[PDB]
Amino acid sequence: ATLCLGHHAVPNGTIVKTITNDRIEVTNATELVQNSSIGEICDSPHQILDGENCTLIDALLGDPQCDGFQNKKWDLFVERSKAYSNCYPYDVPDYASLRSLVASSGTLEFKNESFNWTGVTQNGTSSACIRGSSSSFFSRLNWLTHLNYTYPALNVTMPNKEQFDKLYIWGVHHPGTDKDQIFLYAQSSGRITVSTKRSQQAVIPNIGSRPRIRDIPSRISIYWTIVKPGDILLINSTGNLIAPRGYFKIRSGKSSIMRSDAPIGKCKSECITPNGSIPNDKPFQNVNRITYGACPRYVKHSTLKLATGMRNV
Amino acid sequence: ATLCLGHHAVPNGTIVKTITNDRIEVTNATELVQNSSIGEICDSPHQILDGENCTLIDALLGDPQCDGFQNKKWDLFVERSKAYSNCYPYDVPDYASLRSLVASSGTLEFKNESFNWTGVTQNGTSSACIRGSSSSFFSRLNWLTHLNYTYPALNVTMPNKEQFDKLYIWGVHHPGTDKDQIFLYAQSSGRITVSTKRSQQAVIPNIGSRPRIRDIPSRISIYWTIVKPGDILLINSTGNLIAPRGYFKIRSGKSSIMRSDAPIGKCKSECITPNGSIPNDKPFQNVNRITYGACPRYVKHSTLKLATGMRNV
Amino acid sequence: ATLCLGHHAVPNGTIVKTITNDRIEVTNATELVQNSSIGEICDSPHQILDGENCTLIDALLGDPQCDGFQNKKWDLFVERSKAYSNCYPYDVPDYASLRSLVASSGTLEFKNESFNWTGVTQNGTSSACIRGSSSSFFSRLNWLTHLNYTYPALNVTMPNKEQFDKLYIWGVHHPGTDKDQIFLYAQSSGRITVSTKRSQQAVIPNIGSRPRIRDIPSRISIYWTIVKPGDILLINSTGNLIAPRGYFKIRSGKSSIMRSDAPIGKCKSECITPNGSIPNDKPFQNVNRITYGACPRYVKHSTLKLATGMRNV
Amino acid sequence: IENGWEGMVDGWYGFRHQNSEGRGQAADLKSTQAAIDQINGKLNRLIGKTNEKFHQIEKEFSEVEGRVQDLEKYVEDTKIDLWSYNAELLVALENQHTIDLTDSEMNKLFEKTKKQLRENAEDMGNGCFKIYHKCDNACIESIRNETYDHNVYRDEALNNRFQI
Amino acid sequence: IENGWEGMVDGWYGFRHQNSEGRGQAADLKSTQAAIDQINGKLNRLIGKTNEKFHQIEKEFSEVEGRVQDLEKYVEDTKIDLWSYNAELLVALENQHTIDLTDSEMNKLFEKTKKQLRENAEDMGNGCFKIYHKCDNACIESIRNETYDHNVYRDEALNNRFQI
Amino acid sequence: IENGWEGMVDGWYGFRHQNSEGRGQAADLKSTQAAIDQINGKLNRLIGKTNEKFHQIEKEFSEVEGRVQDLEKYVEDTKIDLWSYNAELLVALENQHTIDLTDSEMNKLFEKTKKQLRENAEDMGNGCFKIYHKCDNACIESIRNETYDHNVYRDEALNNRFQI
Ligand SMILES: *[C@@H]1O[C@H](CO)[C@@H](O)[C@H](O)[C@H]1NC(C)=O
Ligand SMILES: *[C@@H]1O[C@H](CO)[C@@H](O)[C@H](O)[C@H]1NC(C)=O
Ligand SMILES: *[C@@H]1O[C@H](CO)[C@@H](O)[C@H](O)[C@H]1NC(C)=O
Ligand SMILES: *[C@@H]1O[C@H](CO)[C@@H](O)[C@H](O)[C@H]1NC(C)=O
Ligand SMILES: *[C@@H]1O[C@H](CO)[C@@H](O)[C@H](O)[C@H]1NC(C)=O
Ligand SMILES: *[C@@H]1O[C@H](CO)[C@@H](O)[C@H](O)[C@H]1NC(C)=O
Ligand SMILES: *[C@@H]1O[C@H](CO)[C@@H](O)[C@H](O)[C@H]1NC(C)=O
Ligand SMILES: *[C@@H]1O[C@H](CO)[C@@H](O)[C@H](O)[C@H]1NC(C)=O
Ligand SMILES: *[C@@H]1O[C@H](CO)[C@@H](O)[C@H](O)[C@H]1NC(C)=O
Ligand SMILES: *[C@@H]1O[C@H](CO)[C@@H](O)[C@H](O)[C@H]1NC(C)=O
Ligand SMILES: *[C@@H]1O[C@H](CO)[C@@H](O)[C@H](O)[C@H]1NC(C)=O
Ligand SMILES: *[C@@H]1O[C@H](CO)[C@@H](O)[C@H](O)[C@H]1NC(C)=O
Ligand SMILES: *[C@@H]1O[C@H](CO)[C@@H](O)[C@H](O)[C@H]1NC(C)=O
Ligand SMILES: *[C@@H]1O[C@H](CO)[C@@H](O)[C@H](O)[C@H]1NC(C)=O
Ligand SMILES: *[C@@H]1O[C@H](CO)[C@@H](O)[C@H](O)[C@H]1NC(C)=O
Ligand SMILES: *[C@@H]1O[C@H](CO)[C@@H](O)[C@H](O)[C@H]1NC(C)=O
Ligand SMILES: *[C@@H]1O[C@H](CO)[C@@H](O)[C@H](O)[C@H]1NC(C)=O
Ligand SMILES: *[C@@H]1O[C@H](CO)[C@@H](O)[C@H](O)[C@H]1NC(C)=O
Ligand SMILES: *[C@@H]1O[C@H](CO)[C@@H](O)[C@H](O)[C@H]1NC(C)=O
Ligand SMILES: *[C@@H]1O[C@H](CO)[C@@H](O)[C@H](O)[C@H]1NC(C)=O
Ligand SMILES: *[C@@H]1O[C@H](CO)[C@@H](O)[C@H](O)[C@H]1NC(C)=O
Ligand SMILES: *[C@@H]1O[C@H](CO)[C@@H](O)[C@H](O)[C@H]1NC(C)=O
Ligand SMILES: *[C@@H]1O[C@H](CO)[C@@H](O)[C@H](O)[C@H]1NC(C)=O
Ligand SMILES: *[C@@H]1O[C@H](CO)[C@@H](O)[C@H](O)[C@H]1NC(C)=O
Ligand SMILES: *[C@@H]1O[C@H](CO)[C@@H](O)[C@H](O)[C@H]1NC(C)=O
Ligand SMILES: *[C@@H]1O[C@H](CO)[C@@H](O)[C@H](O)[C@H]1NC(C)=O
Ligand SMILES: *[C@@H]1O[C@H](CO)[C@@H](O)[C@H](O)[C@H]1NC(C)=O
Ligand SMILES: *[C@@H]1O[C@H](CO)[C@@H](O)[C@H](O)[C@H]1NC(C)=O
Ligand SMILES: *[C@@H]1O[C@H](CO)[C@@H](O)[C@H](O)[C@H]1NC(C)=O
Ligand SMILES: *[C@@H]1O[C@H](CO)[C@@H](O)[C@H](O)[C@H]1NC(C)=O
């Protein structure tokens, strides 16, 4: 009698790498690299803001076309490549840091404060920002100008008696010409100093024109400061101040910003990549390096096949 | 006759991971992750400063309660979380860099220099810094004020003819009001420029009050510069200068700063972690990520068991 | 009859490491760590500039002894440790960033532009820069001074209508004394602002002497800006301006700077290290950590021997 | 073992036999399941196991920034290059292990068989056992089901092996 | 081999026997020591081998700084995550190796025994050798001490194995 | 196998024999070539495979800069230290594999021989086969060239092995 032992074989196996050879035939192999995204961003489990035309900073400041973002929360904020501002032009020194801070907080929750802007004219507007067909301005900023040809120095002491950090966003105006600065502030030159117990910022306005953008030669710079519980925010300004109207809350968190032109669909998926959501079962991916959530690691290999079978034939 | 071969077994083995299974019973396994610190910092072989209430910067400047740190050396400086300054308040731009530099030098060795502060009044003091029950100031700084209502511009050329780098620590005074600046310097505004052949620093004093700290609305900023052998330190100042009294030596080295509330005991151990010393035989630890000396690597795994035995039963 | 099976052995094998033992004898082992450089830099396949005495910045600005570098290209620029400038002394804030940018562009290709420096005197020179035995200046800079004791504010709008980025290098003069500033610019103080639509730079000249270098107490600071297609470079200056004469092209690229005292020979080799070229067959090297091209990885191991043979005897 | 069996579909490892009743085959489901469990285990340790990150450095840049960007890019490239290394090494080790694993299980099956057929069979170089007792079906299933008793057949198999 | 020996304490690998004098056991100290040396070697390459660092980046932060901190944190997290990977992989490889190592040494002991008892013994599936010479103590120690001479007993063992 | 052959130069693995014609040796070129191909393969996957980089962070510094430099140095040291780890681990795994590889090929050669000499030979503990047919040269080459027919000699070899 004869008894033969052996393995199954398949008509067509696949090729995998080992340490001694690069090309060994195997019955079945599980690709470990998710190439192929869905093509759209899934809308759950994460909370995602679409950011139709709204850079997280335009939403922060309150651009005329980003008024639908007031007090929103997100786990992920998405910026579209087509976004553009449609308001008075601005310049944020260290833009990247402000953007990161707001992004990780994950919220634009804002509360108004009883600031004592007295002896000045509040709510200054510009044709640059049209809302409701009228000249307006960023909704979270208060552009102060002279009142009766007088701009007295301001001195605002706004204490933090709460248990959370307060983020104040404020700016500095840079009029195109001497003519404009005197027209608006009744000063020949201004100066702004903002301080806390821990640190101090100071800015000297820079008068002069820049190439016109949206026909405007002038610009506003954006600065920010964080006030810890127990501290006091002190604002001293002789002019060119774009005042805060209140503060934003800062949360520690799990939120961030991704740049993506992908649409947001009706889907549940944990891993988000600029090229939409990616199923996260495979350990590696080669779709992108920018990811959010419980994602596969990015590798440069186009393929990795892990044998699940055995050597064929 | 029968001869049986086999392995020993134990009543109770332990569980280890392999590549094919997560839970295989093994006779004995050596934990490779040092969880558990001693709970105190060992005082040898490394030289450790305790830093009772002394931030490495307060020790550097010569705070009234850090006078016991003059000319000390360390391999490791430890800061306590309870440390607070008890002297005129200060603001160090790029605090982190100064702190790192002094920390790695590993020494506060200081030598006085024959600076020619002439035509000004030296040794200015404040009620902020009480030593010996009298108003004093930081011991390594010389606060210059006017002399006979005159503050002539200073111009100090202090050459480096030695074979080592000299570190100069100096600062800028920011009086609360115009009243205070004129009182102290007999100038309406000051300016400080410090230079070497390789670089230049310049600071404009910022007059105005900040929230009071220790009842003081005014502050001193700290700046530093390094003079290489062959160079000349040039100090030009019309006011608001907190002058150096000499220089600190810089050594290349193996020293650093750790933040820790652990006590320092009587013990010999090479690896120091904020949570005290850790025996360094195991290759990995999960106590902290902040370490000094010949330490195990930090991993996020709570346990790793390396079989030393064989499969049980 | 007897038939014996076995392996070959060699009189003298070599020693390799495994995972169970550190010292096992093996017939033959291939060293995997290229220790030993050739000792010279190979001149192909890469294009290499020698940089006889020319720091990439001196070549950029047009130092009297770097006039042979006009419009050169490189894959690798090499700086010699003996290089020194031989022209008016300068200070580049963030030197490292300018150096990196020019280095990666890989070219000093420069084109002149029809700048409208009008109402001022162009081509100012100094005894600091001698070329052809006459006082000269950096070849890519235009030192403007007053014309008929007048230095009107300048306002140059130079648009980018091309399809590439334009890099403009310009600087700021810091005269030693008030005497020199008034002599040269017919102003008591100057100010320079340079802007694009995306950003703005502004510099305040700092009058005062620094230790003399090459008998000169005064210095020039170097600043740069990038103009994107569609933008406009706007230069506004009341004095102390070292004007651009044109722009440098920026290319994305594969170029860089290495510091090396090695000579450049007649050789073909892909991997370049400060200590000359290194054959790149072995996967690791321990010659240096600074490399260019398709190089072995740097490891701290002096040796790694990979058995190619089998256990000996 | 010279080649595999294209027609064996009820398991990965198995037996084929020739006797006086006929020819046929069946899988060894204990050998197959053991191979499957180790493979699925290895897959479970890897597949479906990801780490969650939320906020990271910028990886994509559109403007020239200087040395800060050179480092931020350097750091990311180092991470990717190094994880790509780990990924390739891991797969190559896992595949080397998987093929050695499956061959090991096959050798175990072969030894189980020769140890069960104590002295009643000869190892052929083609991976088959020559059985010296003229068995029909029941021995074959007994061998497959680990109940073969070598003490039943040695008296008849040895004289047809060594005594001719 | 079906199971282990809970009562064997003088080594890791060994022998147990049954003869006409009695039953008993002893360790094989060459097999045990070889296993011990390889294991201790592996431990010595790892345990007690650390690297000394003195000054590093900040790892703990108390204030919001912006992108510089995001990178400094990113770099440290990358390092930790990656070293955690290396640590798990290393231990899993070392443990897979250790269990295969000890089983390998056991198989070597088994082969040493069947090669020494040339044709005087049969391999049983329980990890025991059936010895066909009625030996008492001295053969057993001789086998344990690698001095067993198969040429002494084959004349008496073969006729009690194949000739019955 | 007790030791190696210092005089075997025509391959890595081979045979040595003693018969009535004389003593001599020759390499087994299939065993040797298989060992060579796997080793050269492993070398080809590593040697000659480098990655091209062009612009990187500064690694050498001459001046004190502060925290930016501490990080730039930290990042580079982390990379080097970690690649040094990978390099040592890789070589140790490759060498452990290479020595196990070559020993595996030797065991395969040994089994090929005992499987070809079915019951015409005994395994000696010195790595040699005792052959019970008084063969001269032609069997030896036949074994070396995988054409030995055990059915030719069993009738004469068994009676000089078990029947004495
Ligand atoms: C390949 O193996 C996977 C397990 O990873 C299994 O789910 C799949 O169905 C297999 N494919 C084949 C050809 O059986
Ligand atoms: C991507 O992976 C899938 C398997 O999940 C495979 O079918 C496809 O061919 C791969 N695509 C490429 C080109 O990498
Ligand atoms: C975005 O901008 C485009 C162009 O004006 C506009 O058509 C579109 O409605 C905008 N999306 C929204 C809803 O903001
Ligand atoms: C603050 O607010 C009250 C409310 O009208 C006003 O009386 C007072 O003038 C303000 N204080 C200041 C800043 O002068
Ligand atoms: C400015 O407008 C705001 C609406 O946000 C209003 O509450 C505030 O009182 C206005 N101030 C003045 C001076 O009208
Ligand atoms: C505005 O300024 C004028 C001139 O000083 C002054 O008389 C008047 O009271 C001020 N305020 C009003 C009520 O317009
Ligand atoms: C340059 O800018 C200043 C800003 O105050 C302006 O006064 C000057 O007219 C500008 N230069 C010219 C002549 O355009
Ligand atoms: C310079 O020229 C531009 C060109 O339109 C003009 O807008 C600007 O007023 C001039 N002066 C300044 C302030 O730069
Ligand atoms: C993902 O997006 C990047 C950048 O847009 C692109 O280069 C890449 O091809 C995309 N990958 C896939 C899988 O679509
Ligand atoms: C476990 O093994 C270690 C060696 O790492 C040894 O020192 C220890 O005593 C062993 N424990 C037992 C149970 O024998
Ligand atoms: C820490 O390691 C020790 C062995 O050194 C072990 O006894 C202890 O249980 C471990 N603790 C934890 C909970 O990780
Ligand atoms: C640290 O400060 C506390 C609070 O004043 C004081 O009790 C203690 O003595 C101080 N430690 C030293 C010795 O500086
Ligand atoms: C420097 O010191 C000497 C010592 O008194 C003094 O004569 C001289 O006035 C000083 N020089 C300066 C800086 O004027
Ligand atoms: C200031 O006090 C120091 C003591 O450190 C003394 O040496 C120095 O001469 C004093 N200067 C004056 C003006 O008294
Ligand atoms: C102080 O100033 C007065 C007024 O200029 C002058 O007469 C006197 O000589 C100065 N110095 C002294 C000695 O007080
Ligand atoms: C703001 O600060 C300046 C500092 O010079 C001070 O003069 C002014 O009084 C301050 N503002 C007020 C009115 O408090
Ligand atoms: C502003 O108000 C605070 C409140 O006490 C006061 O200390 C300060 O003098 C005022 N002015 C300045 C200089 O900011
Ligand atoms: C070590 O210290 C950190 C921070 O204080 C703490 O989170 C951790 O639990 C401590 N670990 C141990 C082992 O005590
Ligand atoms: C060692 O092996 C290499 C292959 O890497 C070979 O080229 C070299 O000639 C060998 N040396 C000896 C001793 O044969
Ligand atoms: C460097 O490697 C070569 C082999 O390529 C070897 O001969 C030499 O001894 C090594 N040198 C050192 C000391 O590392
Ligand atoms: C570099 O400088 C040295 C010293 O002046 C000079 O001898 C040499 O010719 C210079 N090299 C060139 C050609 O620039
Ligand atoms: C620009 O150049 C032309 C050429 O001479 C000149 O007529 C004109 O004055 C210049 N424009 C300016 C900047 O005034
Ligand atoms: C300055 O010299 C350059 C040569 O590069 C010349 O083209 C330019 O017209 C000169 N300008 C004057 C004012 O002579
Ligand atoms: C130079 O300045 C003088 C005095 O204003 C003036 O008369 C003359 O026309 C100017 N230019 C010339 C041609 O020198
Ligand atoms: C300090 O520098 C300024 C620069 O304007 C100079 O005027 C002053 O004379 C210098 N100080 C002295 C007295 O050297
Ligand atoms: C200070 O002293 C130096 C020494 O020569 C001198 O060059 C300089 O003019 C003086 N003043 C300044 C401007 O610092
Ligand atoms: C390479 O250069 C570095 C720095 O100059 C030096 O430390 C090292 O010894 C050199 N290595 C070799 C192999 O020459
Ligand atoms: C094994 O198979 C035989 C034939 O089918 C059967 O008689 C016997 O009961 C089976 N044994 C077991 C317990 O599987
Ligand atoms: C082996 O054991 C036997 C019985 O104890 C003894 O007679 C013999 O000498 C031993 N051989 C050696 C050399 O160990
Ligand atoms: C094997 O070797 C023998 C003796 O040299 C020879 O007769 C036989 O043809 C060879 N067989 C083959 C096909 O290699």
Numbering used by the authors:
A (entry chain A), B (entry chain B), C (entry chain C): 11 to 323
D (entry chain D), E (entry chain E), F (entry chain F): 10 to 173
Study text:
Hemagglutinin (HA), the most abundant glycoprotein on the surface of influenza viruses, serves as the primary antigenic target for neutralizing antibodies. HA is a trimeric glycoprotein with each monomer composed of a globular head containing a vestigial esterase subdomain in its lower portion, and a stem domain17. Each subunit consists of a membrane-distal polypeptide (HA1) and a membrane-proximal polypeptide (HA2). The HA1 subunit is comprised of a globular domain (residues 116–261) formed by an eight-stranded antiparallel β-sheet motif that includes a distal shallow pocket corresponding to the receptor-binding site, surrounded by the five immunodominant epitopes (A-E).
Therefore, we collected cryo-EM data of both endo H treated HK/68 and Sing/16. Indeed, we observed significant destabilization of Sing/16 but not HK/68 following endo H treatment as seen from the cryo-EM 3-D classification results. Specifically, we observed that ~ 57% of the trimeric Sing/16 HA particles retained after 2-D classification exhibited some level of protein unfolding/destabilization primarily in the hyper-glycosylated head domain and to a lesser extent in the stem/membrane proximal regions. By pooling the particles from the well-folded 3-D classes (100% of the HK/68 particles) we obtained 2.3 Å and 3.2 Å-resolution reconstructions of endo H treated HK/68 and Sing/16, respectively. Both structures were nearly identical to their natively glycosylated counterparts in the protein backbone. endo H treatment of HK/68 resulted in a similar uniform distribution of views compared to endo H treated Sing/16. Interestingly, by comparing the local map intensity around individual glycans between the GnTI- and stable endo H treated 3-D reconstructions we found that several glycans were incompletely digested by endo H, most prominently the glycan at N165, which retained ~10% and ~ 50% occupancy on HK/68 and Sing/16, respectively. In addition, 6 other glycans on Sing/16 also showed incomplete de-glycosylation, specifically, N8, N45, N63, N133, N246, and N285. Finally, we measured the thermal stability of both HAs before and after endo H treatment via differential scanning fluorimetry (DSF) and observed a marked reduction in melting temperature of Sing/16 relative to the fully glycosylated sample along with the appearance of a second apparent melting transition. The incomplete de-glycosylation observed after endo H digestion has two implications; first, that the increased glycan density in the HA head restricts endo H access; and second, that the partially unfolded 3-D classes likely represent a subset of particles where these glycans were successfully cleaved, or conversely, that the glycans with partial occupancy in the well-folded trimer classes are particularly important for H3 stability.
